Amino acid sequence: QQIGTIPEVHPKLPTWKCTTEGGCVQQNTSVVLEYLSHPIHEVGNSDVSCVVSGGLNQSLCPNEEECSKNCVVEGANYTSSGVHTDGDALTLNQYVTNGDQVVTASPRVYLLASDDEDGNYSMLQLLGQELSFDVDVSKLVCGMNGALYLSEMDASGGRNSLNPAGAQYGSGYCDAQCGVQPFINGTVNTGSLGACCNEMDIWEANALATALTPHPCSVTSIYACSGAECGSNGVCDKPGCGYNPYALGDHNYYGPGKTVDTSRPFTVVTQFLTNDNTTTGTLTEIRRLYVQDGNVIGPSPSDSVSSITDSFCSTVDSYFEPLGGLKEMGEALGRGMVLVFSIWNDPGQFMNWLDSGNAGPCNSTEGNPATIEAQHPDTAVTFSNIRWGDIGSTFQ
Numbered sequence: 379q380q381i382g383t384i385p386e387v388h389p390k391l392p393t394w395k396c397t398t399e400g401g402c403v404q405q406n407t408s409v410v411l412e413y414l415s416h417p418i419h420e421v422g423n424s425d426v427s428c429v430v431s432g433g434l435n436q437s438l439c440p441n442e443e444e445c446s447k448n449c450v451v452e453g454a455n456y457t458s459s460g461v462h463t464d465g466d467a468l469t470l471n472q473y474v475t476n477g478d479q480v481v482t483a484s485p486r487v488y489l490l491a492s493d494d495e496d497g498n499y500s501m502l503q504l505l506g507q508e509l510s511f512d513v514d515v516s517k518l519v520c521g522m523n524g525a526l527y528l529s530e531m532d533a534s535g536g537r538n539s540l541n542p543a544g545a546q547y548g549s550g551y552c553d554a555q556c557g558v559q560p561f562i563n564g565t566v567n568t569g570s571l572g573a574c575c576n577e578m579d580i581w582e583a584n585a586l587a588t589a590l591t592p593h594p595c596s597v598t599s600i601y602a603c604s605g606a607e608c609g610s611n612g613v614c615d616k617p618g619c620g621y622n623p624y625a626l627g628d629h630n631y632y633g634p635g636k637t638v639d640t641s642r643p644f645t646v647v648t649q650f651l652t653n654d655n656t657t658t659g660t661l662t663e664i665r666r667l668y669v670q671d672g673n674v675i676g677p678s679p680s681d682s683v684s685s686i687t688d689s690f691c692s693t694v695d696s697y698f699e700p701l702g703g704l705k706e707m708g709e710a711l712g713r714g715m716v717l718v719f720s721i722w723n724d725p726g727q728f729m730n731w732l733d734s735g736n737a738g739p740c741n742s743t744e745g746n747p748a749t750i751e752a753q754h755p756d757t758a759v760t761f762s763n764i765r766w767g768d769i770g771s772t773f774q
């Protein structure tokens with residue numbers, strides 16, 4: 379699909395790269411909506427969409443050349459898609475409103491390194507490094523998921539002559555869920571392939587519960603899976619090695635009025651520690667700290683473990699180590715990965731895996747999207763003050 383005329387204007391979102399000796403240095407980064415959140419329509423006629431019912435218009439897109447000729451991708455309206463930036467803060471709204479009508483926006487955005495015509499995503503290399511961000515989750519109710527994570531997408535988003543849009547229009551998404559989507563790495567997916575790649579879920583959370591989940595794959599960068607390759611233990615680890623402090627033994631660590639008080643903003647620090655403390659060693663531990671009220675809050679001693687390691691993970695996820703465990707996870711982090719921000723909810727299981735049952739305090743039906751939309755249409759997440767770099771150099 380070629381590039382139409384409605385301009386694509388990326389909300390600016392400064393970030394920081396930090397070092398022990400040099401301190402933090404601001405990057406002129408910005409943020410881009412998912413490709414499929416852009417209008418993609420026929421050259422003649424902006425009423426004829428090329429993506430209908432979440433799949434390809436077969437008349438226009440039987441293959442990549444025909445789709446490239448028949449279709450154009452347009453610039454997106456970021457506010458109607460629920461995306462706002464103010465200084466160093468990104469706000470993602472789940473819902474937007476005409477007047478009486480509420481519209482599911484549920485945006486997903488990617489961090490861009492450049493806004494040039496050939497600008498690529500930022501390729502964060504976090505092996506032997508840390509990432510910190512401030513977050514306000516106080517408006518994220520049961521069933522909501524505000525997420526900040528990493529995917530081994532292609533730095534150009536699959537840019538080529540038939541997909542000239544690339545990273546500048548949000549192209550090339552993939553994750554460990556191997557989801558079926560109409561374009562994979564910038565190429566038309568005519569039939570049922572899934573878009574797979576290593577995924578590091580730094581942050582999935584609402585005000586009631588939080589999870590940190592590495593999801594390894596047996597591939598490097600993006601991969602179109604077929605058949606059983608897309609299964610739950612196929613080329614990727616769909617369940618992943620989930621770390622949730624409520625589930626692991628401390629119901630008073632995280633939440634409203636709790637040790638990490640989600641009633642008000644806080645800082646999330648994630649350290650990817652290597653055996654030899656270098657950015658080229660082997661990832662052997664993932665460690666989580668919070669900062670709130672100028673206090674560093676370490677792992678709860680009431681939790682069964684204090685960090686993610688391979689032996690932890692094998693207790694919760696028997697497919698983590700066959701796909702290379704933390705060593706290959708760290709190799710993906712060392713090659714470089716795309717920073718992804720999203721907000722979403724779940725008409726199927728209501729996020730009960732995140733915040734209900736053993737995992738959190740929510741009533742089983744509290745996170746029904748129907749009640750969320752009726753009662754909490756303003757639910758939203760704000761990420762800010764995003765910094766990555768040398769261990770210890772990104773926070774207080």
Ligand SMILES: *[C@@H]1O[C@H](CO)[C@@H](O[C@@H]2O[C@H](CO)[C@@H](O[C@@H]3O[C@H](CO)[C@@H](O)[C@H](O)[C@@H]3O)[C@H](O)[C@H]2NC(C)=O)[C@H](O)[C@H]1NC(C)=O
Pocket residue numbers: 532534535536537538563564598599600601
């Ligand atoms: C995802 O899609 C992108 C965009 O098509 C793929 O990137 C491209 O990969 C091809 C290889 O099939 C590269 O072509 C070759 O490039 C080298 C450059 O040194 C050239 O010497 C060769 O003669 C050949 O033309 C192309 O450069 C590259 N483009 C970009 C922007 O990186 C990518 O491979 C796909 N990823 C996966 C995992 O399939």
Ligand SMILES: *[C@@H]1O[C@H](CO)[C@@H](O)[C@H](O)[C@H]1NC(C)=O
Pocket residue numbers: 403404405406
């Ligand atoms: C951010 O923008 C300013 C002004 O153009 C520039 O001086 C600075 O070098 C930029 N940051 C980076 C990392 O290039």
Ligand SMILES: *[C@@H]1O[C@H](CO)[C@@H](O)[C@H](O)[C@H]1NC(C)=O
Pocket residue numbers: 455457458
């Ligand atoms: C984007 O949409 C909102 C409402 O949906 C509207 O107020 C705004 O003017 C739109 N922007 C453009 C450029 O059309």
Ligand SMILES: *[C@@H]1O[C@H](CO)[C@@H](O)[C@H](O)[C@H]1NC(C)=O
Pocket residue numbers: 651653655769
């Ligand atoms: C590696 O970095 C951590 C981070 O503070 C530090 O505590 C530790 O002493 C370093 N060395 C080893 C061998 O863990």
Ligand SMILES: *[C@@H]1O[C@H](CO)[C@@H](O)[C@H](O)[C@H]1NC(C)=O
Pocket residue numbers: 741742743744
């Ligand atoms: C809490 O759970 C009970 C169990 O059936 C349910 O009847 C009630 O509606 C739930 N509360 C909500 C969804 O707010």
